[PDB]
Subunit: 343 residues, 4 copies
Amino acid sequence: LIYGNYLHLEKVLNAQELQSETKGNKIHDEHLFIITHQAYELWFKQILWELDSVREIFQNGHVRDERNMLKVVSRMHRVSVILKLLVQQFSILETMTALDFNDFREYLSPASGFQSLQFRLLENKIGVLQNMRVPYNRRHYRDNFKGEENELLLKSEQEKTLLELVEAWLERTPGLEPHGFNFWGKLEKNITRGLEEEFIRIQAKEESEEKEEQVAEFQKQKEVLLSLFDEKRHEHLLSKGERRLSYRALQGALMIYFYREEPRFQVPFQLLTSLMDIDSLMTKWRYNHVCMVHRMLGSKAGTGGSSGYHYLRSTVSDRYKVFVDLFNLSTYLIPRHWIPKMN
Amino acid sequence: LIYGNYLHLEKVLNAQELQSETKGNKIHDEHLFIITHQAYELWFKQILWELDSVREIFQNGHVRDERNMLKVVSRMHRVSVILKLLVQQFSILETMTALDFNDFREYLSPASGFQSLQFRLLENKIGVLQNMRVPYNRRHYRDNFKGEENELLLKSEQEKTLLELVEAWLERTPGLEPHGFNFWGKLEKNITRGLEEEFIRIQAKEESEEKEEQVAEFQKQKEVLLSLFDEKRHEHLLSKGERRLSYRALQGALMIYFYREEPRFQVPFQLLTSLMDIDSLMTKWRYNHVCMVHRMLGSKAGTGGSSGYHYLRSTVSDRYKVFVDLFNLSTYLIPRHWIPKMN
Amino acid sequence: LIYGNYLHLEKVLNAQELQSETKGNKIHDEHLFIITHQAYELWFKQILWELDSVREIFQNGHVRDERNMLKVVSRMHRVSVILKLLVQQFSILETMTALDFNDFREYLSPASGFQSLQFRLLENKIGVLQNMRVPYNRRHYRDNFKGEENELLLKSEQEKTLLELVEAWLERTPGLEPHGFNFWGKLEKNITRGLEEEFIRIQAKEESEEKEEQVAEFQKQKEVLLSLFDEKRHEHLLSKGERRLSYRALQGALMIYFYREEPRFQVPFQLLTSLMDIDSLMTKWRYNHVCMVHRMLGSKAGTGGSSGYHYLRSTVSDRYKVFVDLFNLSTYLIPRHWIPKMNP
Amino acid sequence: LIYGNYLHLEKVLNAQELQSETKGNKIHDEHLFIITHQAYELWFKQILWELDSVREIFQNGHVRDERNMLKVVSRMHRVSVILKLLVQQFSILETMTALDFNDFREYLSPASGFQSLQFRLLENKIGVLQNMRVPYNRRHYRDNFKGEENELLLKSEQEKTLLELVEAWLERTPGLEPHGFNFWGKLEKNITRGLEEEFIRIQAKEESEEKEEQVAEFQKQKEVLLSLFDEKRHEHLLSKGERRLSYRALQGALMIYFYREEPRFQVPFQLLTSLMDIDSLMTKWRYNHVCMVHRMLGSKAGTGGSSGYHYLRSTVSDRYKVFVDLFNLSTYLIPRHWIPKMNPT
Ligand code: HEM
Ligand code: HEM
Ligand code: HEM
Ligand code: HEM
Ligand SMILES: O[C@@H]1COCC[C@H]1[C@H]1c2ccccc2-c2cncn21
Ligand SMILES: O[C@@H]1COCC[C@H]1[C@H]1c2ccccc2-c2cncn21
Ligand SMILES: O[C@@H]1COCC[C@H]1[C@H]1c2ccccc2-c2cncn21
Ligand SMILES: O[C@@H]1COCC[C@H]1[C@H]1c2ccccc2-c2cncn21
């Protein structure tokens, strides 16, 4: 073929219709606003392309096969790389002044950011749960989409999410077997014994101002480290939304996290890293978007009532962090010797 | 002289003393931790060097002289550039694993993060207020310091801060004069007349859901826009800490913000931009530091039974933003034609 | 009005046709290759949109009017910001392996990067010159285009380029007037007297190997500074292509460069800076692209009998630098006191 | 200990002596110039710390042991990360104007950028050879040093470089054994038969314009792919300096490069990638340092009538790229099916 025809530039480079130009008063900066979003949507399409291919590798149940595992890790890293660029893409819109923006703002109404199907699909496919999704202007997230788009968005809710699939894989981690290696058993013993060593040692220190603080630190460290073995706490925190992964998935995640230097757990750890990197960048994107909406509209300007800036500020939270459990693995790090070994 | 002697490399490259190596068990990654902090401290010294030079240009009262104004804007931009790099410097410490970090963590005690004199001076010299700051372990920030350091740290609180100096400059903005150009007067009249025209436009509009939805938004925006002309409200918000700049400073800031395209207001706006950039990057530094402490240490782990991650997450707030008023200027943007004519 | 309809997502998100998928054997990484180029082309469209608006502000002859000058500087800075991002966009294609790329490479032929109309227009509108443009496999860039495209590409060559327009503006700089301020005169005298004083200073020093180093450097710098006032040398370098701006434009550029701290020359300098940034980033884009063609195809693999990597290596040079004269202004920097004082 | 004492800030933050201030006329921007270099030198110290630890892991001969292999790959990646930041650090010095720079430039003489011991050690320890070093003002790089420094710089030349150590490791790659798996044998046969099959499809009537260029390209590709198996050519290119790795090392590198998707060759490939990244970033550092030396003092000025810019422009070349052979692995890229099948050997 020919470059332009292969890339369908007859469609791509003929999709720029300025509403200010259509309504007479053509505003120059409107073209930047069009291109920016079109670039974002092209990248969301690519993110979904990678995400759906990764999801299907899991659905086949052959993720553990080293060749398929690499495809997952690499494509997950790619999404991380795309998102990294997408955060930097805000710097283009920083060149647009608040004044020049408002010259065309009026022509954009009533079109909303909530009408970005690709962003919504991307959120749903990762594992952003609808139940613990903050509602704007007493209106639900799916009311903006009314048609074949609503049908496609329902599929993303129903179908197995990336979190659901990663949970499944984490549950099947070798070494968790109580009759086999028994990681959870061995760990509980070394930790309880490690803390007994620690409590007596913080007591075998001179009665200073530092001790009333260290004793109180112990009651919270001991609480955190042992609550790991309390399954009822885990089941209560899951219902609240404070935890996403199942108890067995959490055990698998901790195993990979501790044995990250081991050859068998290097690549599974890389995947966990990529899942955390995707979540951090999804947050940085939301944060950089919040700043953009504050610079252009203000902390009070919204849609027929409540400010848009205050709804979006509540989306830049740990509730929107799908792989929140993976971030909390670091709260349970124990000295190297306390980790059960091998022969 | 000679490269090494000029750069005093006999001091710089002979300041790396590994505590794990001193206490026998040498940990390799400890050297990375030393170098990173030494690089940060060199950059904080440079930030303070620029900041103090900018502060003294203001103190002389000749900041309005175009030649001195350029020195300020350029040096303020430089601080923005240094901070941009310091945020990126976290990526170096991302190469250190949580496991390898804990191997030397023990040797670091009792040295703390808020024992960094340069960072504290940097906060104080910008205008981070002592009353408007969150305490860790019910202790003050100055209690960790003693002697000559505590003496130097009190000077930064007492002496005129960058905010105090910018406020002073903003108060002396030409055009605010009520018998001169009378910007504030002209503005208030234009906003009243503007809202009136906007109202009869919404009133004559065909009675719908969007007609009543627009009335609710009009009433909220009308309230907001005229709240700007209530000086006692401003005075009450200043005491609460919700605002930092004086009422006359806020008027000057709004003048530069609206007339940013004017030749007389391009450079003063660049300064306001750089000040906002500094505040944004100071936040991004705090945020990137809190992501580092959440994956190196725990969400509950800290010093003396305290927050740790939770305290450093309360610093990543608008209360630590010194130039908060400058960010809120956007919440008062009015259509281009409502802005009073300059000539 | 709806988001998708406003942004014409029915066109944009329905323009992804994988050739490997069309020919059966669907290659996954091909979709990344499509999206990447489509993103690049959307950004080239935006760069051209800004560039053409800047060019028309100049063509009206009212660029010296501070309000129009700001529009130019700001939009030129925006192009710099867009280019900065496109350089970083190569990092996306770094995730694609050489192996996975060759699985679909076959399905792309005979389509070439030389068929990117927008990139060619972008080069021509800035002021990349055809006569001093390296030819690939004994074939000119315009041979790869036909019809309406070839007609539109001819217009970009004929019409006033950004360089031609900036040159025009630089020629009309106040202070160059020999009967007025006479900058070039004052500068020539001052550089002569300055070098004389600097010579007394080096000569009165103690005879050592440090003195002979300062001598050889003074002699070299004396040659460079005095060669600036040689207009025929400039005229000869212009014909060779080693310089692009006219002698009077070069004088205006030096004036802005020295008086950059002055209120009247702050914004004109910002423009000069922006142009240099655009040239630097256009080079960094070419460099980051030649580093991808090497990694994906190799040092010797080309289209015809010629090497792809070797040709693209010849574009990452100073001949493709439109604003090359602006980069060389630093070679003529003189001590602050040698600079002629300003008239109030 | 206390933060300041642990980090020896009494040394670090008391090492800033402005020469313009010492000679009366204090220039503000001089402090930026001091801090920038001090930051660079701290990072060069850290790069050397990682580099020397990586070099000793190789010298022990236990680099193939998966646990030690990871230490190497990770620390090599860290150097890549530090260098990435060092390239971005030039943006700090971009805030300094050419005019403000020249106000203090005079006070810096006769100190030179060549007097950076750490940078020289870093170059020598990687594998930048003295035989292929471009000379400035007809003065060798070692002449700018004296005493203990000159003694320490000689050690870096003598001792096994990172290239020498990587070459050694590449030579011992499993599968190269002619009686074992015999990769080079299998590969040679497959490339010959592969080229034959392509020639039969090309030479199959349709004498057009496109067909002749396709013959010209086949003939050029056939030449390059076959010249790979000519060990005589390789040893001639090694003596010229156009290649750095030994013929057996090149074979090992190609094996990892083709079998990169294999579980046994994932981590060795990551190392090769990190080595190439280090080489790319070392170049980007030199290039960004060339742009800066052009913006300040121009393109003609330097030392003793010799151009500073022009010399640093000649260091941006492929001659300074130590792992140049690794970059050229992409030139001998063959269709997936031509690559020999992996059997347990
Ligand atoms: C001029 C800059 C921008 C402004 C002022 C802006 C404003 C807003 C506002 C006010 C909202 C809340 C919903 C609404 O009324 O639309 C929103 C939502 C959103 N915006 Fe933007 N936006 C901007 C740029 C972007 C860009 C460049 C993208 C990328 C495609 C984007 C994607 C979205 C998405 C996906 C949402 C829904 C977010 C969520 O529910 O979590 N916006 N935007
Ligand atoms: C391994 C990575 C790091 C960890 C785990 C870490 C941990 C902490 C912790 C827990 C705190 C709270 C106070 C304390 O107990 O010390 C803190 C404070 C602080 N850290 Fe670090 N830190 C790290 C890296 C850095 C770096 C690279 C710098 C730069 C010099 C830095 C500068 C500071 C400063 C200035 C504070 C006081 C912050 C405030 O009060 O707002 N930290 N750090
Ligand atoms: C897989 C990565 C890429 C490879 C291997 C590649 C390869 C090449 C090659 C070999 C050429 C020489 C002409 C030809 O045969 O096409 C070329 C030219 C070109 N490529 Fe690419 N390219 C890549 C990515 C890109 C991207 C992402 C863009 C951005 C749109 C791009 C834009 C161009 C342009 C505009 C030219 C003409 C350059 C000139 O004449 O100065 N290429 N590319
Ligand atoms: C104001 C910016 C700078 C200028 C004008 C500058 C100029 C130069 C010049 C002219 C040379 C050639 C030798 C000489 O006469 O010194 C050189 C060499 C060098 N510079 Fe700089 N330099 C600058 C910044 C830096 C920085 C920030 C570093 C980092 C430490 C650096 C490191 C070096 C090194 C290591 C060399 C030797 C390079 C080689 O032989 O390959 N320079 N510099
Ligand atoms: O409703 C939004 C108000 O601010 C301006 C953009 C408005 C809206 C919008 C309309 C058309 C095309 C894109 C976008 C967009 C992205 N994020 C929010 N949106
Ligand atoms: O208190 C911190 C707990 O985590 C480990 C580092 C601890 C502390 C620390 C000890 C020694 C030298 C520097 C620093 C530093 C900077 N920011 C935090 N720190
Ligand atoms: O001719 C190029 C050889 O390498 C593969 C891509 C080939 C060509 C190509 C074909 C189709 C779509 C885009 C591109 C592109 C960008 N820069 C070069 N190209
Ligand atoms: O030789 C260089 C000419 O330009 C000014 C700096 C000169 C020289 C220099 C003097 C003192 C301290 C550091 C450096 C350095 C690093 N790279 C170049 N330099």
